[PDB]
Enzyme design. Structure first.
Site, PDB file in Angstrom:
ATOM      1  CG  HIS A 165       6.856  -8.440 -23.183  1.00 39.68           C
ATOM      2  ND1 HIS A 165       8.192  -9.178 -22.905  1.00 39.68           N
ATOM      3  CD2 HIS A 165       6.374  -8.350 -22.060  1.00 39.68           C
ATOM      4  CE1 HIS A 165       8.759  -8.781 -22.301  1.00 39.68           C
ATOM      5  NE2 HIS A 165       6.781  -8.238 -21.137  1.00 39.68           N
ATOM      6  N   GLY A 182       5.553  -7.428 -13.993  1.00 39.45           N
ATOM      7  CA  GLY A 182       5.592  -6.219 -14.259  1.00 39.45           C
ATOM      8  C   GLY A 182       7.421  -6.157 -13.895  1.00 39.45           C
ATOM      9  CB  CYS A 224       9.475  -7.453 -18.639  1.00 33.92           C
ATOM     10  SG  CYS A 224       8.832  -9.144 -18.438  1.00 33.92           S
TER      11      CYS A 224
HETATM   12  C1  LIG Z   1       7.664  -9.285 -17.051  1.00 28.91           C
HETATM   13  N1  LIG Z   1       7.374  -8.804 -16.706  1.00 28.91           N
HETATM   14  C2  LIG Z   1       7.935 -10.778 -16.847  1.00 28.91           C
HETATM   15  C3  LIG Z   1       8.756 -11.267 -15.861  1.00 28.91           C
HETATM   16  C4  LIG Z   1       8.033 -12.715 -15.036  1.00 28.91           C
HETATM   17  C5  LIG Z   1       6.804 -12.587 -14.834  1.00 28.91           C
HETATM   18  C6  LIG Z   1       7.259 -14.137 -13.526  1.00 28.91           C
HETATM   19  N2  LIG Z   1       9.279 -13.545 -13.497  1.00 28.91           N
HETATM   20  C7  LIG Z   1       8.831 -13.401 -14.290  1.00 28.91           C
HETATM   21  O1  LIG Z   1      10.542 -13.086 -14.511  1.00 28.91           O
HETATM   22  N3  LIG Z   1       7.503 -11.603 -18.140  1.00 28.91           N
HETATM   23  C8  LIG Z   1       7.136 -12.503 -18.946  1.00 28.91           C
HETATM   24  O2  LIG Z   1       5.752 -12.812 -18.332  1.00 28.91           O
HETATM   25  C9  LIG Z   1       7.290 -13.275 -20.291  1.00 28.91           C
HETATM   26  C10 LIG Z   1       6.467 -13.341 -21.426  1.00 28.91           C
HETATM   27  C11 LIG Z   1       5.186 -13.900 -21.424  1.00 28.91           C
HETATM   28  C12 LIG Z   1       5.382 -15.002 -20.286  1.00 28.91           C
HETATM   29  N4  LIG Z   1       6.802 -14.498 -19.318  1.00 28.91           N
HETATM   30  C13 LIG Z   1       7.037 -15.601 -18.481  1.00 28.91           C
HETATM   31  O3  LIG Z   1       8.250 -15.278 -17.500  1.00 28.91           O
HETATM   32  C14 LIG Z   1       6.472 -17.099 -18.170  1.00 28.91           C
HETATM   33  N5  LIG Z   1       7.628 -17.913 -19.061  1.00 28.91           N
HETATM   34  C15 LIG Z   1       7.652 -19.063 -20.041  1.00 28.91           C
HETATM   35  O4  LIG Z   1       6.471 -18.488 -21.024  1.00 28.91           O
HETATM   36  C16 LIG Z   1       8.675 -19.905 -20.456  1.00 28.91           C
HETATM   37  F1  LIG Z   1       8.602 -20.969 -19.497  1.00 28.91           F
HETATM   38  F2  LIG Z   1       8.481 -19.935 -21.552  1.00 28.91           F
HETATM   39  F3  LIG Z   1      10.359 -19.345 -20.165  1.00 28.91           F
HETATM   40  C17 LIG Z   1       5.717 -17.508 -17.195  1.00 28.91           C
HETATM   41  C18 LIG Z   1       4.994 -18.797 -17.197  1.00 28.91           C
HETATM   42  C19 LIG Z   1       4.672 -16.443 -16.838  1.00 28.91           C
HETATM   43  C20 LIG Z   1       7.024 -17.358 -16.022  1.00 28.91           C
HETATM   44  C21 LIG Z   1       6.211 -13.039 -23.129  1.00 28.91           C
HETATM   45  C22 LIG Z   1       6.110 -12.262 -23.477  1.00 28.91           C
HETATM   46  C23 LIG Z   1       7.067 -14.617 -22.842  1.00 28.91           C
END
Ligand SMILES: *C(=N)[C@H](C[C@@H]1CCNC1=O)NC(=O)[C@@H]1[C@@H]2[C@H](CN1C(=O)[C@@H](NC(=O)C(F)(F)F)C(C)(C)C)C2(C)C
Ligand SMILES: *C(=N)[C@H](C[C@@H]1CCNC1=O)NC(=O)[C@@H]1[C@@H]2[C@H](CN1C(=O)[C@@H](NC(=O)C(F)(F)F)C(C)(C)C)C2(C)C
Lengths: 306, 306
Positions: B41, B143, B145
């Protein structure tokens, strides 16, 4: 989100760990530039530990009596000297992996990461705090001496601890990198016990701010209090006084969450008087005091290191 | 003595962290040999997260659209491919700090160390466990990830996790290094929630052995029990069944302390039925289930890593 006991990345310190052997005693050493730092009781036999005369034992030793191994490579020792309770072994080779570093003496309540090492090789890393009684709650075994505690500020490694011995109840004591012990302890195998410990109050409040940042907010009450009224209650439950300096350090977390420090103090006063009633804060059933205000900001805002 | 949540030394993994930028999205990547692994992503805008067609988005991208930075040096991308939920970016330069490594898929209940990174730089290291509901209780921000979970066996780094997203209640989910998610989760910003979690029973018993090794022995009762009788009690309090395989893995700790596994099970059965009555075990007011039998042996015997 989420909050965990986070340790500093140990890579910079791993490139400095060497193995120091004198006679049949072996422990860990820190190799910075062309100097190896290690606890001075490496020159001791097991019988020398009950009453060592370190000045007398070092006389009888020469440079070639110190076997220093960096990996599979032996470092030639060309000089030695003793500064308080540490040895400085000058070697003919400067460590090419020497990071930008300082030698600092931390205060009680401040935290740092320990790289537990054996035979010059790292076994693990964990975060600790200098307890008000000048001990640390670590995890050390035989041959763990020479393992260091450190903080990292950008690219600079601030060495603040070197492990020397274990005290009753399984707590540990050591020195700064200049050989000066934290607390009134001596590197001698004789009856020693730490003073009565207290709870680091400024670290508890910072850990409560981390809970509010993470949405754990059941403990927030509706009241405020005076610094004096809070400190009287804190003195009863063996909590250190909260100074105005501590209030100023808690400023960033108070401004981020919109909760004044004295309001969080009123919330902590109720927790000390009523307990937690079977509830947890950030998954912990006890109040946590090994996160400094800087550990909370660094973890909750993701500060990285070069 | 002493027992702490110990993480693996992160040095070997630090030399593999790079920064991956695609468009305006930036996250972390793992640089092993001449391949960079990162969550797929990275090719997504913030609007692409609600319903991404990753196969469609990757079509529209070429090698030069991927900005990979290792420190202050840009790595030229000469190829790319997608394997499940991770991208493989082939670069023209092999990582000279590439350690001996494997890609492994761990089981629920097993532990590993996470090196939380931002913009390709490490922020901290902590130990976690793969929860039975296939989540982990970590600490991640925007960030984060691309941060990886790993185990170290001698000189070999077993990569087992790559962070992808956060779930409700502040828990986290990710994939193995082949892009396969742990659990029934998808890399899409839509309503997802973890299943009900359970307590890792074999890890609780190993943590009780660590307490006995450290002299914390108040909880040891005088009884024994059958594996069946214990598992009925464990099922009531949301504890996983203790299989015969788990008993065999607890062998070394049982032989070291002289306490049969079923005797420690009888002691755990009483703790589950009576609570701890305001007492702590190894300083914890709650039973701990994020130490595997190997974490206890490795910490209590001081196993090092090359
Ligand atoms: C990577 N850099 C981030 C790390 C996230 C950010 C906040 N805490 C973390 O671990 N990963 C994401 O932003 C991912 C990614 C889109 C949205 N996301 C989420 O973690 C979201 N969670 C969900 O949608 C759920 F509930 F289905 F798990 C969020 C609401 C921002 C916490 C993608 C491409 C899935
Ligand atoms: C260095 N390799 C070891 C690490 C110790 C070993 C067990 N846990 C640790 O942290 N340091 C020592 O063996 C030091 C050292 C002699 C004895 N010692 C002790 O830690 C002893 N403690 C004390 O004598 C006391 F109580 F006064 F602190 C021991 C009884 C072995 C725990 C010297 C030269 C002081």
């Amino acid at each position: 989100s989420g909050f965990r006991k986070m340790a500093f990345p140990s890579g910079k310190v791993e490139g400095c760990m060497v193995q120091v052997t004198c006679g049949t005693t072996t422990l860990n050493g820190l190799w910075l530039d062309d100097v190896v730092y290690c606890p001075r009781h490496v020159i001791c036999t097991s019988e020398d530990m009950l009453n060592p005369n370190y000045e007398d034992l070092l006389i009888r030793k020469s440079n070639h009596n110190f076997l220093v191994q960096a990996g599979n490579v032996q470092l030639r020792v060309i000089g030695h000297s003793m500064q308080n309770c540490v040895l400085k072994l000058r070697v003919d080779t400067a460590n090419p992996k020497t990071p930008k570093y300082k030698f600092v003496r931390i205060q009680p309540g401040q935290t740092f990461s320990v790289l537990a090492c054996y035979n010059g090789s790292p076994s693990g890393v964990y975060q600790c705090a200098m307890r008000p009684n000048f001990t640390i709650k670590g995890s050390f075994l035989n041959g763990s001496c020479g393992s260091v505690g450190f903080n990292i500020d950008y690219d600079c490694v601030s060495f603040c601890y070197m492990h020397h011995m274990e005290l009753p109840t399984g707590v540990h004591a050591g020195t700064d990198l200049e050989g000066n012990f934290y607390g009134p302890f001596v590197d001698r195998q004789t009856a020693q016990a730490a003073g009565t410990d207290t709870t680091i109050t400024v670290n508890v409040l910072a850990w409560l701010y981390a809970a509010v940042i993470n949405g754990d907010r059941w403990f927030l009450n509706r009241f405020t209090t005076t610094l004096n009224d809070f400190n009287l209650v804190a003195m009863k439950y063996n909590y250190e006084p909260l100074t105005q300096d501590h209030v100023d350090i808690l400023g960033p977390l108070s401004a981020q969450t919109g909760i004044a420090v004295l309001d969080m103090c009123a919330s902590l006063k109720e927790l000390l008087q009523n307990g937690m009633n079977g509830r947890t804060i950030l998954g912990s059933a006890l109040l946590e005091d090994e996160f400094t205000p800087f550990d909370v900001v660094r973890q909750c805002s993701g500060v990285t290191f070069q």
